[PDB]
């Protein structure tokens, strides 16, 4: 039930919506698409229009990954059973 | 001559014939080895798990109805006497 998540986003800098948008987009996208590959494409496309390009998001039920991301642009959260990781590099 | 007598019959089979033949020998061996039906279910799951890695669910009863979501070609259905040996591997 997303007991532990890692949040690294700016607060009260007018970029507060990025954290809110990620939680809202993940819930809506995951239920309708119902595909691991499709969820990553939809989440990346919505974030790209709102906050510009160079955003990489990977969604897997169970996975281990290490990556370098721009500071305050990486958020990790669990949408229901599924786990979605989205970050901006470059 | 008990092995000849049981004559286990697979009503529905969804697996390779070579693998299916192996299941019949294990099913006959499991019934004689296990004192009770509950022991038979545990023995079949343990032998298959060792033979093939994955999650195996096995239910054997005199009368039952089953609908399951198993990996394709990993579900074998065989009936011996009043016992149903059913194994379905789910990923």
């Amino acid at each position: 039930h997303a007991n532990e998540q890692i949040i690294d986003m700016p607060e009260n800098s007018e970029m507060k919506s990025m954290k809110n948008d990620a939680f809202s987009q993940a819930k809506f996208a995951v239920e309708n698409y119902k595909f691991e590959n499709k969820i990553s494409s939809h989440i990346k496309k919505f974030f790209d229009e709102k906050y510009g390009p160079n955003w990489h998001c990977v969604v897997g039920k169970h996975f281990n990954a290490y990556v370098s991301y721009d500071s305050k642009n990486f958020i990790f959260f669990y949408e229901g059973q599924l786990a979605i990781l989205l970050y901006r590099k470059g | 001559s008990h092995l000849d007598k049981v004559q286990p019959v697979i009503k529905n089979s969804d697996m390779s014939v070579e693998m299916q033949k192996e299941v019949e020998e294990v099913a006959k061996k499991a019934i004689d080895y296990c004192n009770t039906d509950k022991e038979i279910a545990t023995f079949i799951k343990d032998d298959f798990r060792s033979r093939y890695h994955g999650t195996w669910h096995c239910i054997v009863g005199r009368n039952f109805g089953s609908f399951v979501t198993f990996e394709r070609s990993y579900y074998i259905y065989l009936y011996v006497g009043q016992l149903a040996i059913l194994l379905f591997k789910t990923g």
Binding site: K34 | T36, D37, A41, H57, R62, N63, F64, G65
Partner: protein
């Protein structure tokens, strides 16, 4: 009268709506939603003669839409089974009479 008057044939005939839970491993809030759906579905698909395959097909379709894509439930008069399931994903409840129902999430 009372328990002495009651017989196994008499008890089954007297009450067909009695619900008994033998094993619980799923969260109680989740169990309440599942219990109402399974009881309603079995009675609707019971028909003239109860069909084990018919009850399972309706339950399997309802459960997949309701919670997760891979949900397996098996109902039989008597059975022995070993099942590996995720935490709080298995609920075991048997209906009055010779009806055992097993529902788990994989």
């Amino acid at each position: 009268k009372a328990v002495t008057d009651m017989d196994i044939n008499e008890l089954r005939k007297l009450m067909i709506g009695k619900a008994i839970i033998n094993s619980s491993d799923m969260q109680g809030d989740l169990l309440q939603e599942a219990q109402d759906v399974i009881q309603s579905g079995i009675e609707n698909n019971s028909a003239p003669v109860l069909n084990i395959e018919a009850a399972c097909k309706y339950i399997k379709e309802n459960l997949d839409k309701k919670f997760g894509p891979t949900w397996q439930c098996i109902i039989g008069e008597g059975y022995a089974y070993d099942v590996t399931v995720q935490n709080n994903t298995l609920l075991f409840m048997f209906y009055n009479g010779n009806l055992a129902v097993l529902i788990f999430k994989s």
